A = this chain, B = another copy of it.
Amino acid sequence: GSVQIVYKPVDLSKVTSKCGSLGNIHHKPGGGQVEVKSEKLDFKDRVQSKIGSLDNITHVPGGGNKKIETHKLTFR
């Protein structure tokens, strides 16, 4: 007439998220050999300019982890 219930679920899970700019960036602009160098820049009236610049923009609205777990034991 005896009853034994053993309820021992084991959770060893690993959940991992890596999101955004993961790779390495190497930027080496210019660095040449020249005898005489003359640079004349004349910018007027709404000019946007990038010369050898590095712009790294990262947006991560995601990459979130959600874990929901329910355990129910009902006896009689």
A8 to chain B, nearest CB (A): 5
Name A3's closest neighbour in chain B (CB-CB).
Answer: B3
Question: Are A7 and B10 in contact (CB-based, < 8 A)?
Answer: no
- Kindly list chain B residues whose C-beta atoms are within 8 Å of the C-beta of A8: 6-10
Majority secondary structure of chain A interface residues (helix, strand, loop or mixed): strand
Chain A contact-residue range equals 35 or more
Count of this chain's copies in the oligomeric assembly: 6
Question: Are B23 and A25 in contact (CB-based, < 8 A)?
Answer: yes
**CA A8 to CA B49, docked complex, whole Å:** 38
**CA A39 to CA B65, docked complex, whole Å:** 34
The 8 A CB mask of A33-65 against B (1 = contact, 0 = none) is 111111111111111111111111111111111
